């Protein structure tokens, strides 16, 4: 979900 999207975006 969105938390996962933020993790990948900030990688």
């Amino acid at each position, epitope marked *: 979900d*969105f*938390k996962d999207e933020l*993790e990948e*975006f900030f990688k």
Partner: antibody, heavy 119, light 113 residues
Framework: EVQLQQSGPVLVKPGASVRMSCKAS????????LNWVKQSHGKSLEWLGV????????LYSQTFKGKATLTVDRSSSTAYLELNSLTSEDSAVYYC????????????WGQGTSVTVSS | NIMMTQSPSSLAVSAGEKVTMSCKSS????????????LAWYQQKPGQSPKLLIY???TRESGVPDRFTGSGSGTDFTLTISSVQAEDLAVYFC????????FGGGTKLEIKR
């Protein structure tokens, strides 16, 4: 010193689009992510999304996906927010605010751009 | 989304008093990979942009006076101002950034004199 200089206030009609700018100085724009946050009144903040100025990619709140578009011009150290299909519920102050990384707070905020949507 | 609720909506104190204000999240803001609560506090003085006070729920940002302290865990967070100064009047916001970013509705700190 660090600065985020946003463009000035605007009046736009319902249905139109608007683009506003956020110019970083005093630091290297690609070293920080850049968030955009709406303030409709003094007791309300709402996140739009975040830009990676290095890559140019963006992650949008579901609320604003397809409504907001984030871009960057690295050569002039300037980020942009474009908003489409404007309504009177879109009148607000829009802030750009930098964020070092995932776990950080929004450590420096621009002075905001006031957008009024009105006939 | 994670909903943030602040209380009280406003309060008024004389300079030198201690104030506490509450921020509650509708679910955990605990970030698992570093075991940090992704919870930030901001101060917005009249006519100014917000300023970051606290992140990770309890870490003070550089330059923030010692009198501002963030605490809490789980879903219940607190900002304490140990000895309020006249220049502290502001709206104080909390912010979670674990998931799609959301903010509380603010506590407005007024000064009595």
């Amino acid at each position: 010193e660090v600065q985020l200089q946003q463009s000035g206030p605007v009046l736009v009609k319902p249905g139109a689009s608007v683009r506003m700018s956020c110019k970083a100085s005093g630091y290297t724009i690609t070293d920080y992510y850049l968030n955009w946050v709406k303030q409709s009144h003094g007791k309300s903040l709402e996140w739009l999304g975040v830009l990676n100025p290095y890559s140019g990619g963006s992650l949008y709140s579901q609320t604003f996906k397809g409504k907001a578009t984030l871009t960057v011009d690295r050569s002039s150290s300037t980020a942009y927010l474009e908003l489409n299909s404007l309504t009177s519920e879109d009148s607000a102050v829009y802030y750009c605010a930098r964020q070092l990384g995932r776990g950080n707070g929004l450590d420096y905020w621009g002075q905001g751009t006031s957008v009024t949507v009105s006939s | 989304n994670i909903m943030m609720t602040q209380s009280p909506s406003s309060l008024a104190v004389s300079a030198g008093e201690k104030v506490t204000m509450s921020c509650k999240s509708s679910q955990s803001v605990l970030h698992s990979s570093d075991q940090k609560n992704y919870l930030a506090w901001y101060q917005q003085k009249p006519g100014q942009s917000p300023k970051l006070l606290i992140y990770w729920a309890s870490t003070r940002e550089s330059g923030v006076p010692d009198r501002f302290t963030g605490s809490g865990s789980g879903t219940d967070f607190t900002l304490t101002i140990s000895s309020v100064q006249a220049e502290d009047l502001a709206v104080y916001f909390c912010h979670q950034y674990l998931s799609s970013y959301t903010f509380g509705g603010g506590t407005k700190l007024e000064i009595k004199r």
